[PDB]
């Protein structure tokens, strides 16, 4: 299905707020970035500019798996059920807005 | 006032001057009398012999944690004949 380009700012922002704050036992963006098959080396030169969740996305889009779906089944495999509930609607929305348009032809 | 843990810190200070340094017996049976048990008091006593830390501070704040009034501290400072202490926490009312 549809790639990351699907969802933007607003959501890429709220998604930052949640995965950017490093945590002790729950999964932060690093635990994610790893689940998107990034190297111990690539990950550090991420933890560098602020909004790494956001850079992480930009960086995992021009790659393989990068589905919006992948991003979601990943978020749940990683039990961040908080992010899901709260961004749930806002993502399904940003999709019925890509598929929505990107159609006249 | 109202709750143990709402005592002004000097009031608690003057009152952790009593019970604290106050007869290994005169205190120990106030503690055992705080609705506590064998095992618990073993911890709260250990605390005594570490860098000056009011064993009654700890006993008091831990009775704080359990929603203890201040009327209950007063009560058990007479029903235990330790008036020497409540003398101060009536200078407050």
């Amino acid at each position: 299905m549809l790639p990351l380009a699907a969802l933007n700012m607003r959501v890429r922002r709220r998604l930052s707020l949640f995965l950017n704050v490093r945590t002790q036992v729950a999964a932060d963006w690093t635990a994610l970035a790893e689940e998107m098959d990034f190297e111990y080396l690539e990950i550090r030169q991420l933890e560098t500019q602020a909004d790494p969740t956001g850079r992480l996305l930009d960086a995992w889009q021009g790659r393989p798996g990068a589905s919006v779906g992948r991003l979601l089944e990943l978020l749940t495999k990683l039990g961040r059920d908080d992010v899901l509930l709260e961004l749930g609607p806002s993502i399904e929305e940003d999709c019925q807005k890509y598929i929505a348009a990107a159609l006249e032809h | 006032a109202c709750y143990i843990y709402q005592l002004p810190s000097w009031v608690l200070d003057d009152l952790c001057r009593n019970m604290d340094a106050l007869s290994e017996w005169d205190w120990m049976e106030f503690a055992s009398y705080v609705i506590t048990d064998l095992t618990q008091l073993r911890k709260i006593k250990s605390m005594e012999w570490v860098q000056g830390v009011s064993i009654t501070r700890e006993l008091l704040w831990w009775w704080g944690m359990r929603q203890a009034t201040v009327q209950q501290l007063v009560d058990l400072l007479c029903r235990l004949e330790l008036y020497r202490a409540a003398q101060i926490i009536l200078n407050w009312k």
Partner: protein, 107 residues
Amino acid sequence: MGPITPSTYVRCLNVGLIRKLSDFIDPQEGWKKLAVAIKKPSGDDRYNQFHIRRFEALLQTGKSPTSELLFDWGTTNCTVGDLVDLLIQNEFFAPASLLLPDAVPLE
């Protein structure tokens, strides 16, 4: 939000208040007693001997590990209920009273 109720979300809690019921759970290793009381749905310990050690290390940094754990177990929604019902059940009446003066019996 404003009207804290046993239906609201923990991770939605004012950052002022947290640093406040931090002072209850924070001293006398209070939060260790809470950390192990937090259990997944399976029943298994949420945080284990190793996780706990992580938190303990945040004293050399000066961080309310009541908070660092509060936030962190916030990432599973857990109702402010689950918090008191776990506060009461573990004898932390003073803090759970601050949350919701409902189920806070008296000795």
